[PDB]
Design a binder for this molecule. Structure first.
Ligand SMILES: Nc1ncnc2c1ncn2[C@@H]1O[C@H](COP(=O)(O)OP(=O)(O)NP(=O)(O)O)[C@@H](O)[C@H]1O
Length: 450
């Protein structure tokens, strides 16, 4: 009946419990959802813990190398990390065959360099588990134990478990949402937007967070609180999580801190000097993935651009600042006008008639695509804000960027169709970009290569 910690966790409050990976814990109350009351069997300490940091003892989820429901693409990003020795692996659920699993392994070819090999694990009618029919096992852990000693047909002996980063807890702590202004300490100014500032800081003197401040008069706290309730329910690995808020003016917005900064700045400079097409297309794919979730949830971003995409380790990109723009009470901004309104990323029907939809976000994604292929160069280079809308209304569209493949420029043009409903979906954009360089995420090795 005991559980086991999958990761190390540091206590953030007076009532939660710290633990180290591998510690055995007794859930002495699970009547909650994301935060459970636990008791450490080794230390005797009690306290709340994030439910996504533990797994039932002896379960397959308890296995260090079992990544469960991770896609083939996501598993590849993790395995291809430069630090990973050859033979680094993970096991996950197969996407094409229900009930089946998959062993993904990192390999190096002197005529292909670093690469990932995928092997589908089928479970017979009897009960055996196998990659090759000439070798079956009664369990996934038995299989893994075998190939850790002998490659036996695999690209390399299983050597190291794929490392990963601690998952985000849902909320800063149990029941924390509308928090006291004094629970935060601002430490490093990260930037100054148009309606406030952003700082790297600390919550409760223990947790690293990002804090955005809104100048009084920007938007009504009441409307803000209603909208924050909606955004709070949006959870996806390619969306920056909203942690907590201080609803009274000056309004505070606490989200997860992205150390690598914005995509725009990462695009310009030295960080993006040797950035090649395959990298830029993968970042675009991640962005389309988060926006497809937004699409599935029937939500609307309203301010999509490279400045609003954040970067993390493993070239991870996350969609930020969604929903807020709609609350701005600024008179000029409300009329899609002013030096504060991002007209260069706005679809004509949104600017002209205020018709903001997932389709106008698709138009914005097309513009973002140009920043990604021009090292962050500003859209419509020779045009001033005040003349952009009239030009685009008459049919003007940016030409193919220098060095950008025409095929990608064609995608942008689809996103910029005059008819919003003729514009592609984010589901489509994600699939197109993920499979851009011949790779619809298929192909599994056969079995015995020698
Ligand atoms: N969660 C975060 N983690 C790290 N840095 C962040 C984070 N959020 C914002 N920033 C940084 O802060 C600046 C953004 O401030 P912000 O007020 O959001 O301006 P913006 O980029 O101009 N767009 P907008 O907010 O739509 O007007 C950029 O330097 C970002 O890198």
């Amino acid at each position: 009946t005991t559980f086991v910690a999958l990761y190390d966790y540091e206590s953030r409050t007076e009532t939660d419990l710290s633990f180290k990976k591998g510690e055995r814990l007794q859930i002495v109350n699970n009547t909650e959802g994301d935060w459970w009351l636990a008791h450490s069997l080794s230390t005797g300490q009690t306290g709340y813990i994030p439910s996504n940091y533990v797994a039932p003892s002896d379960s397959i989820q308890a296995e260090e190398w079992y990544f469960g429901k991770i896609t083939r693409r996501e598993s590849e990003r993790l395995l291809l990390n430069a630090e990973n020795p050859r033979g680094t692996f993970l096991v996950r659920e197969s996407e094409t065959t229900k009930g089946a699993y998959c062993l993904s392994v990192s390999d190096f070819d002197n005529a292909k360099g670093l690469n990932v090999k995928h092997y589908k694990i089928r479970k017979l009618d009897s009960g055996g588990f196998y990659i090759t029919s000439r070798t079956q096992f009664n369990s996934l852990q038995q299989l893994v134990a075998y190939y850790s000693k002998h490659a036996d047909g695999l690209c390399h002996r299983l050597t190291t478990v794929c490392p990963t980063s601690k998952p985000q807890t849902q909320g800063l702590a149990k029941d924390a949402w509308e928090i006291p202004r004094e629970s935060l300490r601002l430490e490093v100014k990260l930037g100054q937007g148009c309606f406030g500032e952003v700082w790297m800081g600390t919550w409760n003197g223990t947790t690293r967070v990002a804090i955005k401040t809104l100048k009084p008069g920007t938007m009504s706290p009441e409307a803000f609180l209603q909208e924050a309730q909606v955004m709070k329910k949006l959870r996806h690995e390619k969306l920056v999580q909203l942690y907590a808020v201080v609803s009274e003016e000056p309004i505070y917005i606490v989200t997860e801190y992205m150390s690598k900064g914005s995509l725009l700045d990462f695009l310009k400079g030295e960080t993006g000097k040797y950035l090649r097409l395959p990298q830029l297309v993968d970042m675009a794919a991640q962005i389309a993935s988060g926006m497809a979730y937004v699409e599935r949830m029937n939500y609307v971003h309203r301010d999509l651009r490279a400045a609003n995409i954040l970067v993390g380790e493993n070239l991870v990109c996350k969609v930020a600042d969604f929903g807020l723009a709609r609350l701005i009470e600024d008179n000029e901004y409300t009329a899609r006008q002013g030096a504060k309104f991002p007209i260069k990323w706005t679809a004509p029907e949104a600017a002209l008639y205020g018709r903001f939809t997932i389709k106008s976000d698709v138009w914005s994604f097309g513009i973002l695509l140009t920043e990604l292929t021009t090292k962050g160069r500003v859209p419509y280079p020779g045009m001033v804000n005040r003349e952009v809308l009239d030009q685009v209304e008459r049919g003007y569209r940016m030409p193919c960027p220098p060095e950008c493949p025409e095929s990608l420029h064609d995608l942008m043009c689809q996103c910029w169709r005059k008819e919003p409903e003729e514009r592609p979906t984010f589901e489509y954009l994600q699939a197109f970009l993920e499979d851009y360089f011949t790779s619809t995420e298929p192909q599994y090795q056969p079995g015995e290569n020698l």
